[PDB]
Amino acid sequence: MLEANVYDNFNPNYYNISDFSMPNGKKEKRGLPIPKARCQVINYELWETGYLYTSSATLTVSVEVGDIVQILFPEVVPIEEALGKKKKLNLDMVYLVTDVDESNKATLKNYFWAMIESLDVPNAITKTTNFAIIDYLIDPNKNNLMSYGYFFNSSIFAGKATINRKAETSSAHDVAKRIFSKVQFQPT
């Protein structure tokens, strides 16, 4: 089986407050909590990015809608954040619980797509580079879910943004899909 860390909703109305006293002295944003329960995931279908289908899993503990599920793997992923710099990143599959049935089978939605929900973006923002759109989309002050900054490969998002149809107001989902298709990348 796979190990799961169940946390309550990463409410940005709570965690987006710089009142945490750091050991040096200065104030930083509230850190993520400890899992309310450590459980194990059985009878699962887990998607890495959630480009086409939504994930599903039957969890041992009785999770509820809103809770964040962190699926753990005993392996490490090396991500190149700077030209030469690489960092030891532990393998994770982070989802938001959308619905739980009678048999405790939880419908899991990939954290990113559940974060950029209901967010609309005008044509004015699509005029600049792809970096400007990513910097707009990922913001814990606007988002439904908490985020402590993105990690991005400059070379792939260096290019000029794709031209919008009718130069209208598009949703964060439609623009991300349009951008991720041209750049040939998906978020994790």
Partner 1 sequence: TIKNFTFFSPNSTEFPVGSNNDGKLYMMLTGMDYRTIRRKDWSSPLNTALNVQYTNTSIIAGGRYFELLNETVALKGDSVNYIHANIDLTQTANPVSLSAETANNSNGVDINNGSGVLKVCFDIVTTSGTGVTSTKPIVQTSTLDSISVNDMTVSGSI
Partner 2 sequence: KATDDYTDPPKMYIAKNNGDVIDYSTYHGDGTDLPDVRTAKTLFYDRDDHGNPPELSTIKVEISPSTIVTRLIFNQNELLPLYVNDLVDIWYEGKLYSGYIADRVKTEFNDRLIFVESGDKP
Partner 3 sequence: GVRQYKIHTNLDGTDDKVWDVTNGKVRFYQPSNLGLQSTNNIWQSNGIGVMGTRSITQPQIEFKLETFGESLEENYQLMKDFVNDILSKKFVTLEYQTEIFQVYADLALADVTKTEGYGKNGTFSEKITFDIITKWYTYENLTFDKIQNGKVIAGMSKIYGGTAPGNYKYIKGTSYTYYGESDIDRLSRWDIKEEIFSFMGILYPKLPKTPAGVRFLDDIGNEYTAIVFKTEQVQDYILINTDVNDETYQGWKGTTALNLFPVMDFERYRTRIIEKGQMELINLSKAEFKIKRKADFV
- Binding residues for partner 2, rule: CB under 8 A, are 9, 11-15, 17, 19, 66, 117-122, 124, 141-145, 169
12: partner contacted, choices partner 2, partner 1, partner 3, none (Cβ within 5-8 A by kind)? partner 2
> Please, which residues have CB within 8 angstroms of residue 131's CB and are 6 or more apart in sequence?
152, 154, 157, 158
> Please, which residues have CB within 8 angstroms of residue 152's CB and are 6 or more apart in sequence?
131, 134
Segment (H or E) for 89: strand 86-100
For residue 6, the minimal CB distance to partner 2 (Å) is 16
Q: Please state the φ and ψ torsions of residue 78, each to the nearest 5 degrees.
A: -90, 115
For residue 78, the minimal CB distance to partner 1 (Å) is 4
Token output for 88: 């030891």
* Residues in contact with partner 1 by the rule CB under 8 A: 33-34, 36, 76-78, 86, 88
183 binds partner 3 per the rule CB under 8 A: no
3 binds partner 3 per the rule CB under 8 A: yes
38 binds partner 3 per the rule CB under 8 A: yes
